From TrEMBL:
The keyword Aminoacyl-tRNA synthetase does not apply. InterPro entries: His_deacetylse_dom, His_deacetylse_dom_sf, Ureohydrolase_dom_sf. GO terms for molecular function: hydrolase activity; metal ion binding. This is Acetylpolyamine aminohydrolase. Gene3D superfamilies: Histone deacetylase domain. Zn(2+) binds at D194, N196, D307. The keyword Metal-binding applies. Keywords: Hydrolase, Metal-binding, Zinc. Residues 86-261 form the Histone deacetylase domain.
Length: 393
């Protein structure tokens, strides 16, 4: 089926992720491997693997150069890649050439100890670069209208540095290939439910994409990583984001709209789906109607983390002002399978009922670190897909 796919790294690609930090107790290798074993075992889903997609020669040669250690050969070989190759045009539409040099540089500089530690949250192996790109390849090179991909995370990656387990911003590049693959740019909408703020992806959209039409609903808790609240955004947009509702502000910069759903200020009303994701759906219910009666299409991007679950034990989702948040507060500020299952079910319903307006869906794995929590949430996620987005058997 070209209509939907589910993307995991291959054996080799996943294997070259050891020592790569996660905000949990396991490295990113175990973490992603566990999810992949589950996804392969859950019967028959349309599952694609980063080993089968072969890149053009010049990519395979930049890779090869990285392996033998010639930092000037790699630096040069990459500089001379075709400016119109599908990967690279999107890659350098969001990432500075100096960052990519420094990165290639780190991968090779890493080959000694098998790993090069940049800062507390950023490690690279020799093959980090090959995988980051072999990942970005397969998503770019595959015509799936509803893409769920399980790889290394992205919404903290900046146009110019890496931060917090993120090395490049695969989401923004995927938006790049959408502005250019379409005749008229699609109306963009992002909903990122990872409990840590999409600080990175946000900077890249203010900087390089403010002219595209993007509605970006960013759900996070200004109390965990990275401690940034509305005052911090004000200094970022050097404007003052107006309050639209449940202590949630919006900023406009040219054609980009950024909504900050802060989970501290937005607490839940006894029973019913968490107000944070009800606004996420009120705004995606509307963005669909706007683009219908205007005729344009919509590309829908879900950079989703599960550390926003109440059942997350990772420090970066649960250590709130000096102590670990507890089961009472956790249920008033985080999400439970009730909330999530409703959300995913609603999202796909809007899609199925508006395949004339909603165009592509891309869901990409950000946070969610506790093993028994994320394995349960995944089973939920796979079951809603098996029901809504797959032809029945
Ligand atoms: K987020
Ligand atoms: Zn996160």
């Amino acid at each position: 089926s070209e209509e939907c796919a589910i993307q995991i790294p291959s054996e080799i690609d996943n294997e070259q992720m050891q020592r790569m930090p996660a905000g949990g107790e396991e490295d990113q290798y175990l973490r992603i491997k566990h999810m992949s074993a589950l996804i392969k075992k859950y019967g028959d889903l349309p599952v694609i693997t980063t080993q089968e997609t072969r890149l053009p020669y010049y990519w395979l040669d930049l890779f090869a150069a990285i392996d033998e250690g010639d930092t000037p050969k790699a630096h040069a070989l990459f500089h001379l890649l075709p400016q119109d190759d599908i990967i690279l045009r999107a890659l350098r539409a969001v990432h500075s050439e100096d960052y990519l040099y420094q990165l290639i540089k780190y991968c090779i500089q890493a080959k000694h100890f098998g790993f090069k530690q940049l800062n507390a949250d950023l490690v690279v192996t020799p093959k980090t670069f090959e995988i980051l790109i072999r990942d970005c390849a397969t998503t770019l090179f595959n015509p799936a209208k509803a893409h769920f991909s399980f790889g290394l995370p992205s919404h903290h990656a900046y146009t110019q540095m890496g931060s917090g387990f993120c090395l490049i911003n695969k989401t923004a590049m995927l938006m790049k290939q959408a502005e250019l693959s379409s005749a008229q740019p699609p109306k963009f909408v992002i909903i990122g439910t990872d409990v840590n703020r999409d600080n990175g992806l946000c900077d890249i959209l203010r900087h390089s994409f403010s002219h595209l039409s993007i509605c970006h609903i960013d759900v996070f808790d200004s109390r965990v990583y990275p401690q940034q609240d509305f005052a911090y955004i004000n200094n970022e947009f050097n404007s003052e984001g107006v309050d639209i509702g449940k202590n949630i502000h919006v900023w406009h910069h040219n054609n980009l709209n950024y909504y900050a759903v802060d989970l501290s200020l937005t607490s839940r009303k006894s029973v019913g789906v968490h107000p944070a994701l009800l606004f996420a759906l009120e705004q995606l219910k509307e963005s669909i109607r706007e683009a219908k009666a205007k005729g344009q299409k919509i590309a829908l991007y879900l950079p989703t983390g599960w550390d926003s679950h109440e059942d997350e034990t990772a420090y970066c989702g649960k250590f709130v002002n000096g102590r670990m948040m507890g089961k009472t507060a956790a249920h008033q500020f985080r999400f439970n399978d009730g909330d999530l299952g409703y959300f995913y079910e609603s999202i796909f319903t809007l899609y199925n009922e508006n395949k004339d307006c909603v165009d592509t869906i891309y869901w990409g794995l950000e946070g969610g670190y506790d093993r028994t929590m994320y394995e349960r949430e995944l089973k939920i996620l796979l079951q809603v897909i098996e029901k809504q987005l797959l032809p029945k058997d």
